[PDB]
C-alpha cells in the first residue's frame, strides 16, 4: 500500500531563467503545494504506473543510488515516443528512443565482484529500439526532480543534496534550477521509474499555486510562501512581504456559491398546439403541407398516450422516450395526409413519389415523424388530398413545392395547357373507405426539432425544478434568471404583476408561477475576508474575520462586523489595539 | 502549395478525421483508432448503425476540383523572443561596444541602452537580470 507523508516545502524551482536580487516576486505557475500529501515508495526485499497529471515532483533519497531510470509517455506500447532516462555510473544517459515496452523494465545488480553490481548490460526494458527523436550522453543523499510538459517542453529541475535523515523528506528548503529542456512534444499521461534489482522515493503532483518567492542577493531562492495554503499566507501574497506587521489586512473575498438551480414554469397553463396539428380539421396537402411553429410550450407529448393513436410513431434522430427529458428549440410539425404506402417514403434519405417530389426529408433529419389513419374521417370518394406526380428533379430539404406550371415531358412548349407531352404535375388521391390498407389515407405529422446548441422555447414534458427556501440557489422563474436566497415574504403584489423590484431596479421580489406566492431575493453573502494578525514577529497565528456575514456558510464567534474565526471572545474590555469594526478590537496576549 | 500535380494520381493515402467527440486543442494529435459512436449501444470497436470510422481519406484525383485539389500545408512555428536563438536570420554576431549608446539584440532580447561591465553575479543557467520594475536591467553576453 502507498504510504503518505508530508511534502513540507520541497518542490520550489526557478520558474524561468531570469535573475533577481533581494526582491520578493510573486509568480503563478505549476508547483508542488506546501504540506500536500505525497505518495511514498520503496525498493526492498514497486514501480507501478503513476498518473502523470500536470507534472511530477519526484525525489529519491539514496545511499547507493539505486533509482536510476524513468519511462514516461501515454501508451507504453511505443505508439508514441517515450522519454527514457538512464543514469549509468555517474554518466547521464538520456533518450527519447522509441521501443516496445516490456512490463517490468529494470536494472540488474550482482554482488561483490570486479565489476560492481555488474548487469550494466542487464537492460531488458523491451525488445528493441526503433526511432530516436533525441539523444544525449554524459540517508546520506537526496535527489529531487520536477517533470512537466508544456509547449512541447519536458522540463527537468534538479537538486543533488546530501541530507541526514533515514525516514522521510528532510524538512528544509532549497529550490530547483533547470537541468535540461528536451522539447520532444510527445504527451505523457503515465510513467514508470526504472530500478536496479538486487531505495525510497516520492511522487508529488504539480498544481497551479501562486507563490511569493524570495530571491536573495546572489539571486537564489531562500524562501517561498504558498498563497492558497492558509489565511496567514494569503496575506503575504497581498503585501509582497515575508514579515506581515501587526494590524488587520483585507486579503480575499468569498462568494457563497449556489446550491443547484430552480427552473419554474406555471403548470398546465403553457400548452403546445399539438392537437391543432394532430387533430387539425383538414390537413394541408402533402405537396403543400402545414408547417406550424411549435415554440414557447411545455411538451404535451405525454397526453398522446391515450387516444386512437398512430399508424406509426417513428423518431428518426433521437429516442422517443427521452423526449420526457428532452427540451427543444425549433419544433415545426409537418402536417399532411397521404396514401397508405407512403408513410414509408417519409424518412431521411428515402426515394419515392412522396419523398422525391411533393415532400422531402433531409438526410440529416432529426425528429419524430408521426402518422395515423384518417380512414375513419377523411375517407367517404375524397379527392381533396392531392400529390405531385412529376417534377424536374428531387426536392431540396423540406421543399414545399406548390408550382402549378403544367409539367412538360417534351421540348415543344406546352404554353401552360394540357395535351400530348403536357401533364398537370399535381395528381389527386381519391379516398374511398374500402381502398387497400396501402391506399388508406394516413394523417402524417413530422416534428422537426434541432436538439442542442440553442436556447429552449419548447419546454420538456417535465423540465421542472421543485422550489427551495432559505438556501442559496441559482433560479430561473418564467425566463427570469437570478441567483439568490429565496424566502417567504409578506410584500403583496397586484395580481397582473410579475417582478417586484427595488430602488436600484434590481430584482427583489418574485411570484412563483406554479403556485402564486411572493418570494424575496437576497445576494449570496460576500463581505471581505480580513486577516487579523499580531506581527509575524510575535506569532504565526491569525484570526480570520469574515465581514458582514452570518456564521453558517463558513472556535467561532459572531460579531457586529461579521463572522470572526480563531479568536477567543473576552468579556473583559481593554484598550483598542487592532481595530476591527463596531468597537470590536483584537489583541494578541492571553 | 498544391500537391494536386504530384500526390494526386486518386490518392487515398492522405486521410482526415471526419468525426471527433470534441474539438482539438493546439497541436493535439489524435492517433486513436476508436470508431465514432453515434448510438447508445456499444460499437465494440466494430462498425454498424451509428458507428462510423471517423478517419476518412479524400481520394485526390488531378481531375478533382480546386476545392478537392490536395494542398500541402506546412505551418512554420516559432517561439519569438526571451529564449536562446537557434534558427537565426542572415545576421552574424556583431562586435560588442561598451559605454556607448547602442541599439542591441542579445539572443533575441532587444532594447536600447548603455552596456557596461557589471559585478552582479548570475547563476549559470540564467539569462536575464531584471529590476523591480520588470525592466530588463542586466544581461549576460551569450558568447
Amino acid at each position, epitope marked *: 500500500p502507498p504510504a503518505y507523508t508530508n511534502s513540507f516545502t520541497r518542490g520550489v524551482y526557478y520558474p524561468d531563467k531570469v535573475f533577481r536580487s533581494s526582491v520578493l516576486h510573486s509568480t503563478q505557475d505549476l508547483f508542488l503545494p506546501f504540506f500536500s500529501n505525497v505518495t511514498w515508495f520503496h525498493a526492498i526485499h514497486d514501480n507501478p504506473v503513476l498518473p502523470f497529471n500536470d507534472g511530477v515532483y519526484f525525489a529519491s533519497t539514496e545511499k547507493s543510488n539505486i533509482i536510476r531510470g524513468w519511462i514516461f509517455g501515454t501508451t507504453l506500447d511505443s505508439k508514441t515516443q517515450s522519454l527514457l532516462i538512464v543514469n549509468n555510473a555517474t554518466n547521464v544517459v538520456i533518450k527519447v528512443c522509441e521501443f516496445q515496452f516490456c512490463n517490468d523494465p529494470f536494472l540488474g545488480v550482482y554482488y561483490h565482484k570486479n565489476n560492481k553490481s555488474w548487469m550494466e548490460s542487464e537492460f531488458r526494458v523491451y525488445s528493441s529500439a526503433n526511432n530516436c527523436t533525441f539523444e544525449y550522453v554524459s540517508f546520506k543523499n537526496l535527489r529531487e526532480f520536477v517533470f512537466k510538459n508544456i509547449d512541447g517542453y519536458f522540463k527537468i529541475y534538479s537538486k543533488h543534496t546530501p541530507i541526514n535523515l533515514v525516514r522521510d523528506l528532510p524538512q528544509g528548503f532549497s529550490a530547483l534550477e533547470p537541468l535540461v529542456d528536451l522539447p520532444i512534444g510527445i504527451n505523457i499521461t503515465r510513467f514508470q521509474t526504472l530500478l536496479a534489482l538486487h531505495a525510497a522515493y516520492y511522487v508529488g503532483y504539480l498544481q497551479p499555486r501562486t507563490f511569493l518567492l524570495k530571491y536573495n542577493e546572489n539571486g537564489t531562492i531562500t524562501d517561498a510562501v504558498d498563497c492558497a495554503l492558509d489565511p496567514l499566507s494569503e496575506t503575504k501574497c497581498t503585501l509582497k512581504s515575508f514579515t506581515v506587521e501587526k494590524g488587520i489586512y483585507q486579503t480575499s473575498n468569498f462568494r457563497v456559491q449556489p446550491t443547484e438551480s430552480i427552473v419554474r414554469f406555471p403548470n398546465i397553463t403553457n400548452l403546445c398546439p399539438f392537437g391543432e396539428v394532430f387533430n387539425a380539421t383538414r390537413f394541408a396537402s402533402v405537396y403543400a403541407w402545414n408547417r406550424k411553429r411549435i415554440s414557447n410550450c411545455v411538451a404535451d407529448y405525454s397526453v398522446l398516450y391515450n387516444s386512437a393513436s398512430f399508424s406509426t*410513431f417513428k423518431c428518426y434522430g433521437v429516442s422517443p422516450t*427521452k423526449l420526457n427529458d428532452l427540451c427543444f428549440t425549433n419544433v415545426y410539425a409537418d402536417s399532411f395526409v397521404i396514401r397508405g404506402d407512403e408513410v414509408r417514403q417519409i424518412a431521411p*434519405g428515402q426515394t419515392g413519389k412522396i419523398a422525391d417530389y411533393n415532400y422531402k426529408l433531409p438526410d440529416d433529419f432529426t425528429g419524430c415523424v408521426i402518422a395515423w389513419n384518417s380512414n375513419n374521417l377523411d375517407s367517404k370518394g375524397n379527392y381533396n388530398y392531392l400529390y405531385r406526380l412529376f417534377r424536374k428533379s428531387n426536392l431540396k430539404p423540406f421543399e414545399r413545392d406548390i408550382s402549378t406550371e403544367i409539367y412538360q415531358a417534351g421540348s415543344t412548349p406546352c404554353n401552360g395547357v394540357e395535351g400530348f407531352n403536357c401533364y398537370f404535375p399535381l395528381q389527386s388521391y381519391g379516398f374511398q373507405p374500402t381502398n387497400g390498407v396501402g391506399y388508406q389515407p394516413y394523417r402524417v405529422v413530422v416534428l422537426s426539432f434541432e436538439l442542442l446548441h440553442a436556447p429552449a422555447t419548447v419546454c420538456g414534458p417535465k423540465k421542472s425544478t421543485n422550489l427551495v427556501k432559505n438556501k442559496c440557489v441559482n433560479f430561473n422563474f418564467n425566463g427570469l434568471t437570478g441567483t439568490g436566497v429565496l424566502t417567504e415574504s409578506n410584500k403583496k403584489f397586484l395580481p397582473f404583476q410579475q417582478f417586484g423590484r427595488d430602488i436600484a431596479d434590481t430584482t427583489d421580489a418574485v411570484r412563483d408561477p406554479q403556485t402564486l406566492e411572493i418570494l424575496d431575493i437576497t445576494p449570496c453573502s460576500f463581505g471581505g475576508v480580513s486577516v487579523i494578525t499580531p506581527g509575524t514577529n510575535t506569532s504565526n497565528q491569525v484570526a480570520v474575520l469574515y465581514q458582514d456575514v452570518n456564521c453558517t456558510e463558513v472556535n467561532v464567534f459572531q460579531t457586529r462586523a461579521g463572522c470572526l474565526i480563531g479568536a477567543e471572545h473576552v468579556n473583559n474590555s481593554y484598550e483598542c489595539d487592532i481595530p476591527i469594526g463596531a468597537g470590536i478590537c483584537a489583541s494578541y496576549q492571553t | 502549395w498544391n500537391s494536386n500535380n504530384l500526390d494526386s494520381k486518386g490518392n487515398y493515402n492522405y486521410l482526415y478525421r471526419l468525426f471527433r467527440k470534441s474539438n482539438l486543442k493546439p497541436f493535439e494529435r489524435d492517433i486513436s483508432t476508436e470508431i465514432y459512436q*453515434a448510438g*447508445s449501444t456499444p460499437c465494440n470497436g466494430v*462498425e454498424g448503425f451509428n458507428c462510423y470510422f471517423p478517419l476518412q481519406s479524400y481520394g485526390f484525383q488531378p481531375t478533382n476540383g480546386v476545392g478537392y485539389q490536395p494542398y500541402r500545408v506546412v505551418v512554420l512555428s516559432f517561439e519569438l523572443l526571451h529564449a536562446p536563438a537557434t534558427v537565426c536570420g542572415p545576421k552574424k554576431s556583431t562586435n560588442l561596444v561598451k559605454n556607448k549608446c547602442v541599439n542591441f539584440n542579445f539572443n533575441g532580447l532587444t532594447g536600447t541602452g548603455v552596456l557596461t561591465e557589471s559585478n552582479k553575479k548570475f547563476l549559470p543557467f540564467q539569462q536575464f537580470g531584471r529590476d523591480i520594475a520588470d525592466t530588463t536591467d542586466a544581461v549576460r553576453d551569450p558568447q
Partner: antibody, heavy 119, light 106 residues
Framework: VQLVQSGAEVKKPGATVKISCKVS????????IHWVKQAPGKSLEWIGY????????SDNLKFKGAATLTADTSTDTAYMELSSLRSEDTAVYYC?????????????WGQGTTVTVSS | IVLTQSPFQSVSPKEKVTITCRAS??????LHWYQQKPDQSPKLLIK???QSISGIPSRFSGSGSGTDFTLTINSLEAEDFGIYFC?????????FGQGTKLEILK
C-alpha cells in the same frame, strides 16, 4: 432466411446488455426488424421495431431500459441493448423481421435471446 | 390499444377451436396470430388476420368483427396444440395476446 443472434448474456441488476441478431437469406435493408421479449412463462412483450436504413426506433414505454435497437448494414446484425437492467428483464429476446411500411408481420424470428438479470 | 387472448383452449380432435383476440377501444383491420410450441419462438399462422403464409395448415383461420378477433382452427391435430398470440396492428406498438395455451384431449 436466417436470424443469427448473440449468445445468452447473464447480467447484474443495474448492468447493461447488448444483443445481436444477424440477417441472412433475405434482403436486410428492405425489412424492418421487430423485437419481442418473452419473459419466463409469460407472453410476448414487444420492446421495439427498428429500421435497417434509419437509426430511429419506436419504443414500447413500459419497462425503461434506455433500449436502443441498432442494426448493421455490413453484417446485417441487429443489436438490441437493454441497459439499467433489473431482475424482471430476465427473459427471452426474439428478434423479428418486419416490412418497410404500415404492414407489420413477423413470420421469422431468431431462436430468441435468453438473458438473466440476477444478483 | 390493449388486446387480450384466451388463456387456455381445451378441445378434442377434429373439433373446431375458436380463440378470441379482444382489443379495447379502436381496432385495426390487420392482425397476426402466433403459434408457440414450448421452449420455441412463436410461429406466425395468420396475416392481416385474413391470410396464412404458405405451408401453414389451411385448417387455421383468423378474422375479426367489431373489436373482436378470433383464432379459429378446424380439426385440431395432436401436433397442433400450442401457445397462441395475436398482434395488435397500427395504433402505436403492438400488445400481443397474454398467450393462449391450447391443449388437445382424447
Amino acid at each position: 432466411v436466417q436470424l443469427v443472434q448473440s449468445g445468452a448474456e447473464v447480467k447484474k441488476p443495474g448492468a447493461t446488455v447488448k444483443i445481436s441478431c444477424k440477417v441472412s437469406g433475405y434482403s436486410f435493408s428492405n425489412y424492418y426488424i421487430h423485437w419481442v421479449k418473452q419473459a419466463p412463462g409469460k407472453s410476448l412483450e414487444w420492446i421495439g421495431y427498428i429500421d435497417p436504413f434509419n437509426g430511429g426506433t419506436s419504443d414500447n414505454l413500459k419497462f425503461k431500459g434506455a433500449a436502443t435497437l441498432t442494426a448493421d448494414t455490413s453484417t446485417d446484425t441487429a443489436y438490441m441493448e437493454l441497459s439499467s437492467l433489473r431482475s424482471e428483464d430476465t427473459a427471452v429476446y426474439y428478434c423479428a423481421r418486419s416490412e418497410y411500411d404500415p404492414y407489420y408481420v413477423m413470420d421469422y424470428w431468431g431462436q430468441g435471446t435468453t438473458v438473466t438479470v440476477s444478483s | 390499444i390493449v388486446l387480450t387472448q384466451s388463456p387456455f383452449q381445451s378441445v378434442s380432435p377434429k373439433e373446431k377451436v375458436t380463440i378470441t383476440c379482444r382489443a379495447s377501444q379502436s381496432i385495426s383491420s390487420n392482425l397476426h396470430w402466433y403459434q408457440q410450441k414450448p421452449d420455441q419462438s412463436p410461429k406466425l399462422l395468420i396475416k392481416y388476420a385474413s391470410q396464412s403464409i404458405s405451408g401453414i395448415p389451411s385448417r387455421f383461420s383468423g378474422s375479426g368483427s367489431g373489436t373482436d378477433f378470433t383464432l379459429t382452427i378446424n380439426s385440431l391435430e395432436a401436433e397442433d396444440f400450442g401457445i397462441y398470440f395475436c398482434q395488435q396492428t397500427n395504433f402505436w406498438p403492438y400488445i400481443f395476446g397474454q398467450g393462449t395455451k391450447l391443449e388437445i384431449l382424447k
